[PDB]
């Protein structure tokens, strides 16, 4: 047995990084807060829009503190129109090869110094929620929310792992909202299962805050929506949102859904997200109360750069997918807040 | 802001109490060596015969699973020299949406969830199929479960709904035993040339130990990986379809070989079409179609299905299955067909 | 500042691991449920028979063991009216050699743990499943979460008996439990930790996963003293007497079991059958504080270094023909006793 | 199984208490020096006296903290004659049953919070250690070790547990000097086959890091020496320290001891542990070569009191074994580094 297992390394258990970073009073409030904003939109008691929005992956928690710092006065003045939350995700999920993210690989030398990663990035959460700026969340494996989930005030599944049961599984017992991506080709049948499959309870094996594998029972998840992102061509217009609306109400689900302003949706081109956002938002003023978020993939450089060995690199700007810059960030959100305004008013 | 949604935490007991309490046998352990080393000279295109992978949807009742058993390694005993018979001993069901996940999840199907009982009549199950000299086959869908039975297991199929997973292929690239990755459930060929290219290459990654404990692992990666068609919104075992797969596996650099499931999306979910597939695919094989390794069909001791009252004997609780009758007759089917491509 | 003394570090089974293996068979359970029972009505007083520990110094082999247990067992149906009968299965000699059958199952300095494990369990199932009870020594915290559930009676090591870490472990455990007076042959030490053991405990130990965890015990009433000699033997009647006192004193149950070996035989093993006189006459004369006596003895007497079968490879036994005379004479003084 | 274990509860593992609470760069330098000089007085090469001196048992780390600063003033001031090192004593045996320290039950009211005991133990350790002031413990427990032994510069196995193999074993493997108490009834042998055994290798069951049982292999310690702490009598006299050099070099031990001015060598009079000083003093003075270390129970309160009262406790002072007072402490520290400088003369 374990023929292909070449090696076994010790893995620092959740309750270490639990203790050595854990939630201050600010932090915990904020996530506590954050989390009801998001069910009382999600259950319609509230018209503000949840916007999800930063970096496509944080490399650099200097850089993303700062990017926090600029968002959170955001946050404060767009309060009245705008559920604002930080997109604070540590790996951009590929095929090709490349760096594995901010936990895998923090120190960006192709090595994996895990244990490295898992304190970098609990730390960053804890800095950015004790700011009193809520974070959202990828998550890609059963492991890692152990170590993170209680500084997440939204999550989403990712896009590859939609259909899978131990995600859904996953989801069914997170204690914030999710946030599942339509199929690749469009489709949101595989989402609308997703988020009926979550919404119920479940019993799985997982790993507890010890580092060690149990039975876990779920109550199952009543915050799940489903995340626009396009298939082929984008999926943003007032066209596509009807059909989904439709679908939705047709599977016995609030008719409500979060538009991801980036690639497919933007044909990958990062500036594109502001052609989105001016048709999201002409939706929005028009009257449309379906759209209850957005995600946006902002930082505070615009574009992005590629990694390079041994050369130090641009500060506040994505070495994954590109970015928009602060500046139209600020535009957009401006955008988006009148666009709430209006909508009401 | 932890635990809110978590209902209940239960002790589990860990992969290496399975193992000390049914440890291989001598025979279970050749059955397995034997077979994976089978398996492999099929996919290094070294042995010109074809992999069988056959039984029931799930396992639900081990003593019917042993009569099922019995009457398999009768045929792959006769069939030796155009076969290689491998049961489907499937613990793990990968639900649309809800449902029962499988023997291990829920050994008594009362939504009780005795885990612990339903890994050791698993594991039991499993050795006593190996021991008696038959081959294993499984779905890994679980990430924790895989410790407690891969010694065990000769054969692997990751499903159609995780082929994409990238924690999933992670899996595979871990694993001792030959892996084949289906189709997505829309018939997109590229997710699972994507994966097996991924299982192939080591991984650096979070796991679960034999002693119950999260860790770093690091894999070699799994040469041995191979697709299953499985059709999408039409059926994908046509020689047509399988043209264009090889294609897509050449220009992907891999060796074109398939593996072909004759059950779901490609007999429209319904049965008896499963004969019509076997038709079809011996066709190809005789034929001359080399690239076409293995198969997989869905059969059980009595034909059809039925709702999980006591269950009635020998039929499957999850997907419809083909009765014995009917899986004597497809076996000896394709082993003539195996016959005609050689001589 | 961290582990520069520590050399390396083994995957250790943990003890869920040989329960499933070894799990206690009806037959097994039942004659550990019965014989902790029995020893229990023996303490409260309610119950006139002698508990008798009687067995090999330490095992060493599996074979000579089972064979000695089916000996041992023909003459606890027999006697059974007088002795509770209970076998000696010490896997280890405590001294400052051989590290015992856990520790070195093979004979040979290798540190096989994991087996040694699995070989003592194995052998302790089936002698329970026979319907011999055992008795076991308790050296350390950790060994017992893997063997404890097979025996109905227990000795704390005499070098451990003033430790606070083995009382704690005394208190939760399920069987009753002997501490032996002191190598001078004062009792005091053994009094505090009977006193000790029958209280309520929290402190740190290793669970049957094999993790760390917060435990809270009931304390254990079933413990009493082992008088073992000191500089001189202590088994005379007049030694009983004193010690009775001493108990009384303590507010503790005046009763005893007395070692028949080593400083109350002055060494020689042989001399066990001249305490089996001293006690047994102190018995059929109407002493009722002694429950029970313990006994070192295998198939074949004496002892050797490291082979011969059935003898001994640490202290000295008596042979299979005094043993069988030693259990009659005891019950022979237990009849006396009672009518 | 089961039968009298009531309650079964979760305990952080030693990494999650080493992550909260590493040790400064100085707290390693601390107890990096105080090991190596130590070291050196054992081999011979130091003339300078051990001194392990402070309270029965820490019970409230705000008057600890206040004793360390205290003591490390005169440590920095005695340091040619006296290599001082704090009493840390977080566990105690107790004779049959009592309060067993402020691990086991920090808040002294039966409700034992381990986990909080723990936490409250390693910070206080850690404060005192990067304050510059090396600490002393008494290692009881088979599983506490592992949480605090990187900021233990010497530790002591206590007259109760000489004789166990486990003690011996444990000392066998760990990073610090050890002493081994004389037994209770004043027999000095139990205490040089203690030595003895710790300077063996060994192999054992005990718990890593990660709160798992595993097989530990040592590789033995050399840095082990009795301690003289009385027996029926005291045994801190000219006649009885001959008595035990001369059974040291009979067992091919250096001649060398620690001498306790407390329990049965002051009768468990407080007060005449400086009764004891005196008389070590003269002998040290005197040329006695052999003593090369003292241990005294001090606090900065003299006496003791009860808990069992229920009265709010009075500050700085025991509620264990009787201590000398601060006052008393200075004089007793000033008489010892005289004593070295005489001896040295
Ligand atoms: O075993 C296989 O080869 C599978 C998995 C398949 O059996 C699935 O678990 C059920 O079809 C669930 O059915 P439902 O759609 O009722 O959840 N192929 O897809
Ligand atoms: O700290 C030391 O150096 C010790 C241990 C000692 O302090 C013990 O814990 C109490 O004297 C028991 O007190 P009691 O007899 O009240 O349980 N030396 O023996
Ligand atoms: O953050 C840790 C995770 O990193 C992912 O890239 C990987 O696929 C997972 O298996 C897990 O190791
Ligand atoms: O490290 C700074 C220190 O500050 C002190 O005031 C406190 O008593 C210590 O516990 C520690 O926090
Ligand atoms: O049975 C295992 C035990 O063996 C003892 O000899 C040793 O002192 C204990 O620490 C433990 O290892």
């Given at each position: 047995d374990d023929l292909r297992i070449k090696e076994i390394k010790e893995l620092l258990p959740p309750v270490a990084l639990l203790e050595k970073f854990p939630a201050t009073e600010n932090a915990a409030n904020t996530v506590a807060h954050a989390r009801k904003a998001i069910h009382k939109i999600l259950k319609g008691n509230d018209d503000r829009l949840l916007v999800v929005i930063?970096?496509?992956?944080?490399?650099?928690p200097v850089a993303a503190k700062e990017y926090a710092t600029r968002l959170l006065a955001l946050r404060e003045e767009l309060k009245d129109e705008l559920e604002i939350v930080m997109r604070v995700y540590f790996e951009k999920p590929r095929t090709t090869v490349g760096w594995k993210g901010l936990i895998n690989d923090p120190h960006m030398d192709?090595?994996?110094q895990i244990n490295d990663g898992l304190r970098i990035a609990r730390k960053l959460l804890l800095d950015i929620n004790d700011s009193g700026l809520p974070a959202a969340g990828e998550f890609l494996?059963?492991?890692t929310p152990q170590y993170l989930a209680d500084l997440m005030s939204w999550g989403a599944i990712g896009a590859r792992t939609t259909e899978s049961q131990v995600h859904r599984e996953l989801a069914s017992g997170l204690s914030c909202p999710v946030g599942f991506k339509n199929g690749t080709?469009?489709?949101?049948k595989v989402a609308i299962d997703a988020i009926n499959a979550a919404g119920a309870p479940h019993c799985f094996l997982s790993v507890t805050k010890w580092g060690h594998s149990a039975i876990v029972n779920t109550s199952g998840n009543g915050d799940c929506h489903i995340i626009l992102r396009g298939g082929?061509?984008?999926?943003?217009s007032a066209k596509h949102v009807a059909e989904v609306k439709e679908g939705l109400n047709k599977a016995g689900l609030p008719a409500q859904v979060m538009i991801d302003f980036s690639h497919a949706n933007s044909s990958k081109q990062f500036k594109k997200q502001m052609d989105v956002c001016a048709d999201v938002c002409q939706q929005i003023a028009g009257?449309?109360?379906?759209?209850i978020g957005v995600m946006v993939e902002s930082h505070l450089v615009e574009g992005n750069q590629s990694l390079e060995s041994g050369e130090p690199l641009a500060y506040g700007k994505s070495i994954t997918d590109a970015c928009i810059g602060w500046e139209d960030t600020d535009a957009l959100l401006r955008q988006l807040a009148n666009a709430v305004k209006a909508r009401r008013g």
């Open positions: 930063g970096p496509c992956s944080i490399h650099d192709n090595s994996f494996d059963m492991i080709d469009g489709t949101i082929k061509e984008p999926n943003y009257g449309e109360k379906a759209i």
